[PDB]
Amino acid sequence: AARMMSQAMRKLAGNLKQSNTLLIFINQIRMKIGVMFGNPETTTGGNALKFYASVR
DNA sequence: TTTTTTTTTTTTTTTTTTTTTTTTTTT
Secondary structure, three states: OHHHHHHHHHHHHHHHHHHOOOOOOOOOEEEOOOOOOOOOEEEOOOOHHHHHOOOO
């Protein structure tokens, strides 16, 4: 799923800018197990979306 | 090269405090 999302962002980012189209992804929260330091909260679908997003 | 994923489950009692009020003559 993380790989699928990483391939999709690469392709979309160029096309969206060219057509002046806004894309909104809704995402859910998950817990990371075995965490002492920081927030245990994360999101689904890997790390690519965090990078490519202009607003979160 | 290429990329994360997702919570689990309650445990166990502690200690006493303080007195109120008279009643009735017998030859």
